[PDB]
Design a binder for this molecule. Structure first.
Ligand SMILES: CCCCCCCCCCCCCCCCCC(=O)OC[C@H](COP(=O)(O)OCCN)OC(=O)CCCCCCCCCCCCCCCCC
Ligand SMILES: CCCCCCCCCCC1=C(C)C(=O)C(OC)=C(OC)C1=O
Ligand SMILES: CCCCCCCCCCC1=C(C)C(=O)C(OC)=C(OC)C1=O
Ligand code: SF4
Ligand code: SF4
Ligand code: SF4
Ligand code: SF4
Ligand code: SF4
Ligand code: FES
Lengths: 213, 180, 226, 589
């Protein structure tokens, strides 16, 4: 129930993303597994976002940064302006055609480990802007870990996607050292939130009438 | 610079430091997500559902008004008919990776079947799983509009509702009747 | 022939009536019972325009453009206040008994009655009483029948009898209980009965073959073919 | 007589002056619903007409807009000169409080107009945009290159034959060769701009400020030529935030374009919604009642306070103090609580409709409005006394990137900058829309110098006046309908739709095919949160817009940027960027 990705920019592959993904089993060792759990906990409980913004979704993201929401409680407030110091790219805005090379460059300039959260309908699929100058989804050329529907998603939805990213990180397998062991990245094939919440979503019967407040 | 300007600036820095200290002695304004639930207004435009009539049947008549009123084009459906003659959606899919949660489909629904519920936690790992189907949209209740049924107004005969049994409808008078 | 529509001079054919002459020029007059192939009968009373005999005339007279010839020297007004109120009133009278059926109607989005209700600008209902209802007949595998949506414009019977030569469709009934169909249930055995779904301005006669797998007109991808 | 009537505008003295100057057979006058005299003039006399308007006793000193229009598909052109393309120039005289719109007709093969940059220096970006999107060449233009599209783009996107959707073209395939080609295209070439990349003593430093910069308020880049820390010249490179919203206006119905109007200036919301729905109501002939006007004024002033709070907090953050942004966004959350209660959404409400609003006010909105009006002024006074009266902030702000009224007028600067130059020109008072005459509020003006500090303090005073407007409208809200009784009110009221067949028919044909607005031209100019926002809508008589032209102030401000910061340091540029109140959806549209 895992997927393995190995990347190779210099290999024979012209289209982005320059990676290969297969479906494998969990490789996980009486102490290596515990140390992998400890580093996964340390990575998931300390995620530093990239100060990269495209459009209105970034405004709601920095609304989440402020005091009335306090995403700092999750340890995700540091907001580095450099790609090298950042661990998470939140594509929060429209993936414009003129900025897709810029987004690809900034994704290349981040360092391992890296995670991608697409925020909003523009970043997910292009959204309302099925237009000549908009890339229909940032996942056309970068691998996206978490998707957030919304236009804009409210800040608590951004923290919900951050918690989903933390749950994804906390059970993935990565190379502990770059000199010993396999260098491929193992990510879990988790159950989707739609089928998980279908039990509690279908059973909804009555809501408050729109004339109230 | 002038000495008075320097003194005024020193007092200004001291005053700013004092006010941020009194901010430290103030009350916290954070809403503690996710430990306390987020208050959402009753007409908040979040996750889209398909609702039912008070009789318990699905309120959608597959009239395709929401799909064409959608400025994004992220609603797809097909009309099917039961044996009695009532219309229903054979399928109903919404691409939530593409939807902008604008509420034009709810505004354009003439049966109040499609509604935007106060729900925002729809984060997903794969955007193929963001294509919600009819089994993920149809809920077991009326939603925000509790006592509206479109078929009580329609003049089309279905099960449990013969001709003339709708609201503001007279009984069908046959042309073979003896009355002038 | 030369006519004057709203003070504008137009050159029309004098052997045509005012409705087809004005519709040829691009002037929008509401109409139900007139068809280019069937002729003019003056039934629906929807095509009313105010006619003047002189260039200096204030009162005028509300006439039917489908029944009035486009002779030389006629001064008609389409968007006069009296004519617009009368056309809105005709739409309102047709709307008194019409069922609340547009979402569950195969003619929705392709409806002449919808277009003419919108064109006259009638969107407020002051009628508060009951609406008459009708039973439906089985017309065979091709044509679905829904008699409540009828506006009694007589296009179906005129086409089916005076044009197609059919013998099993007719008008029955009375004052406001007019029925349009067959004397019993059965298949319409005319070989041209399928044109009723386009002749009828309402959703009375509908394509049952299309009603099995129904989509609206805007959802259809069309092509010109043979 | 209603204000949406088609006025020929032959009573304007500017028309009489043009007749007495150029003769009675030199131009045509078009009768529109713009409220502005539309003069079709010949291409040969365009510069003479512009010079005559610039040399008037109360002259037209501002070029409000300059853009093209494809008239090849326009069926209803009665009373208009024959044209395959056209170029319109919208000009404002503040002294007369009047506008004029000059239109030049062009054939398909002879697509060249004389440049307007010598008369008005802000015409440069407008002419580059018209060349980029319509292919119209401007003779005598200094550097006519693409401004919205990358340099390796084939075709002009706003032409009628160009496909609007991305699904028409192949899906975006990013390969190594395409990445290299677009990176070479995006690389700044100083020899093209005449930057002269060197001196005998030392070498100039070419720095990309943006797209990925904390100081850049979006996806755009200023390329700085530097010596040490000083800025020699700037090339503000825009077009990175282009969503094709005007081509989208040609692609959506009149009702279904409202959410796209909401995202034009994403800190504006209902302020972005108002000019579009007002222009559509002018097209339809809808006069909204008093309650609709008061509700729309409520929501637009609430969003103006929201945008001003974000602007003030952003300016304080870029000056260096990182504390008040948290509290300002807490106040934004209070406003968002009220807006969520009313419209059902936070930041892009899309709540205005043609002829009214989407719903009535919910029961209990006045409680949240009273809560916000009690919460606000103490917080604002705290922000003032903590950061806006800081001598370090004053040193970073006062005297930085200063210009007078001449620079504000020649570059089309509107909003707080123009009033900070001492020119008292606000749309809510000069050309009152949406019943703003019923509200007692003041218009703050400056002393004649448009500093960073002056613009920020003017926006603080605008926030206080918006609080006054909110108090007045809370204390006096009418009890009437939230939608008009016009047949073209889209959509009709919901309960009548659910239980009447006429209303059901109107709703069915208005949400599916769209409302049919008759063929006319309409224009609405409003005071946005960042300046003056205008919608110019050409209807072909169909259910979709034939042309949707959106004029925004941030475009003019970013074009003004090199003329006001040249010779300064980069810190002055950072404060100038923080004190302009721009977003980049506003610029690129
Ligand atoms: C502990 C000792 C604290 C001494 C400073 C207290 C300052 C109190 C205060 O609120 O000062 C702010 C005020 C700002 O002045 P202004 O912006 O004109 O506002 C007028 C209304 N306050 O500031 C002023 O009006 C300035 C007057 C106070 C100047 C104090 C000078 C102390 C001696 C010099 C020390 C610094 C020397 C630097 C070299
Ligand atoms: C191995 C030790 C690692 C230490 C990592 C410390 C990270 C920085 C924490 C403090 C901090 C700084 C300096 C900082 O620069 C900053 O940005 C304004 C913060 O707020 C978001 C901070 O919280
Ligand atoms: C982390 C501590 C709180 C940060 C709050 C930031 C609020 C917004 C700052 C202004 C800004 C906006 C609006 C903005 O749109 C933008 O471009 C993407 C910026 O650069 C990153 C900005 O700095
Ligand atoms: S999804 Fe909506 S809010 Fe987010 S960037 Fe796109 S238009 Fe803006
Ligand atoms: S909320 Fe708007 S974008 Fe989403 S499905 Fe409904 S109409 Fe379409
Ligand atoms: S508008 Fe309502 S009734 Fe019509 S197809 Fe959509 S959900 Fe069904
Ligand atoms: S016939 Fe036309 S007006 Fe009547 S219910 Fe059908 S679509 Fe509506
Ligand atoms: S059934 Fe149709 S064609 Fe016949 S009279 Fe009625 S509305 Fe007219
Ligand atoms: S069209 Fe003339 S009365 Fe019917």
């Amino acid at each position: 129930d895992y997927t393995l990705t190995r990347i190779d920019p210099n290999g024979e592959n012209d289209r982005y993303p320059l990676q290969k993904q297969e479906i494998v089993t969990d490789p996980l060792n009486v102490f290596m597994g515990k140390l992998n759990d400890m580093v996964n906990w340390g990575r998931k409980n300390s995620i530093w976002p990239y100060n990269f913004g495209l459009s209105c979704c970034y405004v709601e993201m920095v609304t989440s940064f402020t005091a009335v929401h306090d995403v700092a409680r999750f340890g995700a407030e540091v907001l580095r302006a450099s790609p090298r110091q950042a661990d998470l790219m939140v594509v929060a805005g429209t993936c414009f055609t003129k900025m897709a090379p810029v987004i690809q460059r900034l994704y290349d300039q981040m360092l391992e480990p890296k995670w991608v959260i697409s925020m909003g309908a523009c970043a997910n699929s292009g959204g309302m802007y099925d237009i000549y100058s908009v890339v229909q989804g940032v996942d056309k050329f970068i691998p996206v870990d978490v998707y957030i529907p919304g236009c804009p998603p409210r800040p608590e939805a951004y923290m919900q996607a951050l918690m989903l990213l933390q749950e994804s990180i906390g059970k993935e397998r990565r190379p502990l050292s770059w000199v010993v062991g396999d260098q491929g990245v193992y990510r879990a094939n988790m159950q989707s939130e739609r089928e998980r919440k279908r039990g509690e979503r279908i059973a909804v019967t009555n809501l408050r009438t729109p004339d109230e407040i | 610079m002038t000495l008075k300007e320097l003194l005024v600036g020193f007092g200004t820095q001291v005053r700013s430091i004092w006010m941020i200290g009194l901010h430290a002695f103030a009350k916290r304004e954070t809403r503690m997500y996710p430990e306390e639930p987020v208050y959402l207004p009753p007409r908040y435009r979040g996750r889209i559902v398909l609702t039912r009539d008070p009789d318990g049947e699905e309120r959608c008549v597959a009239c395709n008004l929401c799909a064409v009123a959608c400025p994004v084009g992220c609603i797809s459906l097909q009309k099917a008919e039961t044996k009695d003659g009532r219309w229903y959606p054979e399928f109903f899919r919404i691409n939530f990776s593409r939807c902008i949660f604008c509420g034009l489909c709810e505004e354009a629904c003439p049966t109040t079947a499609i509604q935007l519920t106060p729900d925002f936690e729809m984060g997903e790992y794969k955007r193929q799983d963001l294509v919600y189907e009819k089994e993920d949209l149809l809920i077991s209740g009326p939603g925000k509009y509790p006592e509206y049924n479109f078929y009580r107004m329609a003049g089309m005969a279905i099960d449990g509702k013969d001709k003339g049994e709708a609201e503001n409808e007279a009984k069908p008078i046959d042309v073979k009747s003896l009355l002038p | 022939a030369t006519i004057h529509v709203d003070g504008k001079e137009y050159e029309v054919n004098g052997a045509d009536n005012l409705l087809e002459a004005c519709l040829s020029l691009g002037l929008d007059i509401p109409y139900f019972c007139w068809h280019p192939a069937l002729g003019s009968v003056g039934a629906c009373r929807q095509c009313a325009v105010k006619q003047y005999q002189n260039a200096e005339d204030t009162r005028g007279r509300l006439v039917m453009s489908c029944m009035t010839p486009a002779s030389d020297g006629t001064f008609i007004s389409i968007d006069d206040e009296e004519a617009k109120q009368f056309r809105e009133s005709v739409v309102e009278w047709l709307m008194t008994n019409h069922p609340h059926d547009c979402p569950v109607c195969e003619e929705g989005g392709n409806c002449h009655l919808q277009d003419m209700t919108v064109m006259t600008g009638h969107s407020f209902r002051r009628y508060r009483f009951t609406k008459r209802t009708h039973r439906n007949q089985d017309l065979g595998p091709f044509i679905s029948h829904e008699m409540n949506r009828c506006i009694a414009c007589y296009r179906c019977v005129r086409y089916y009898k005076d044009y197609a030569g059919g013998t099993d469709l007719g008008v029955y009934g009375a004052h406001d209980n007019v029925y349009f169909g067959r004397p019993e249930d059965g298949t319409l055995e005319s070989e041209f009965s399928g044109n009723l779904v386009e002749i009828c301005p309402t959703g009375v006669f509908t394509d049952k073959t299309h009603s099995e797998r129904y989509n609206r007109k805007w959802d259809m991808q069309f092509a010109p073919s043979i | 007589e209603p204000a949406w009537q088609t006025r020929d505008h032959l009573d304007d003295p500017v028309i009489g002056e043009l007749r007495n100057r150029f003769g009675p057979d030199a131009f045509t006058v078009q009768a529109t619903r713009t409220g502005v005299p539309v003069v079709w003039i010949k291409r040969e006399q365009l510069l003479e007409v512009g010079d005559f308007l610039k040399k008037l006793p109360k002259p037209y000193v501002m070029l409000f807009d300059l853009h093209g229009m494809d008239e090849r598909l326009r069926t209803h052109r009665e009373g208009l000169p024959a044209a395959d393309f056209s170029v319109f120039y919208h000009l404002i005289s503040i002294d007369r409080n009047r506008d004029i719109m000059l239109k030049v007709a062009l054939a398909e093969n002879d697509l060249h107009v004389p440049t307007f940059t010598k008369l008005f220096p802000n015409a440069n970006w407008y002419e580059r945009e018209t060349w980029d999107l319509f292919g119209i060449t401007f003779d005598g233009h200094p550097n006519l290159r693409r401004i919205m599209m990358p340099q390796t783009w084939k075709g002009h996107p706003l032409r009628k034959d160009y496909p609007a959707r991305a699904t028409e073209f192949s899906p975006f395939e990013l390969t190594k060769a395409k990445q290299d080609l677009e990176m070479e295209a995006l690389t700044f070439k100083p020899e093209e701009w005449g930057m002269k990349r060197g001196t005998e003593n030392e070498d100039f430093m070419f720095l990309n400020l943006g797209p990925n910069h904390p100081s850049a308020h979006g996806a755009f880049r200023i390329v700085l030529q530097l010596d040490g820390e000083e800025i020699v010249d700037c090339v503000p490179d825009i077009g990175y935030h282009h969503r094709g919203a005007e081509k989208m206006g040609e692609r959506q119905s009149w009702h279904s374009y409202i959410p796209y109007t909401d995202r034009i200036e994403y800190l504006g919301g209902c302020v972005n919604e108002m000019p579009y729905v007002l222009a559509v109501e002018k097209l339809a002939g809808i006069t909204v009642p008093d309650r609709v006007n008061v509700i729309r004024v409520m929501l637009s002033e609430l969003f103006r306070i929201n945008s001003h709070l974000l602007y003030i907090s952003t300016f304080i953050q870029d000056v260096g103090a990182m504390t008040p942004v948290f509290f300002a966004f807490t106040d934004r959350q209070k406003i968002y609580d009220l807006v969520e209660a009313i419209t059902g959404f936070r930041m892009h409400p899309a709540w205005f409709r043609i002829g009214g609003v989407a719903h009535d006010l919910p029961r209990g909105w006045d409680r949240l409005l009273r809560e916000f009006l009690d919460w606000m002024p103490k917080r604002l006074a705290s922000y003032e006394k903590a950061a806006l009266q800081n001598t370090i902030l004053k040193g970073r702000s006062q005297g930085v990137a200063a210009y007078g009224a001449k620079e504000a007028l020649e570059w089309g600067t509107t909003g707080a900058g123009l009033r900070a130059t001492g020119i008292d020109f606000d749309v809510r008072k000069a050309r009152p829309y949406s019943g703003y005459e019923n509200f007692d509020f003041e218009i703050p003006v400056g002393g004649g110098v448009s500093d960073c500090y002056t613009r920020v303090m003017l926006k603080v005073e605008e926030l206080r006046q918006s609080l006054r407007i909110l108090e007045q409208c809370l204390n006096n809200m009418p009890e009437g309908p939230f939608k008009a009784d016009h047949p073209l009110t889209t959509p009709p009221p919901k309960e009548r739709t659910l239980q009447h067949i006429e209303t059901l028919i109107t709703h069915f044909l208005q949400v599916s095919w769209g409302p049919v607005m008759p063929a006319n031209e309409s224009f609405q100019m409003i005071e946005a949160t960042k300046g003056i926002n205008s919608y110019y809508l050409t209807s072909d008589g169909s259910t979709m817009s034939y042309r949707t032209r959106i004029r925004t102030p941030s475009y003019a401000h970013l074009q003004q940027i090199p003329a006001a910061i040249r010779g300064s340091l980069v810190s002055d540029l950072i404060v100038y960027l923080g004190s302009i109140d721009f977003v980049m959806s506003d610029v690129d549209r």
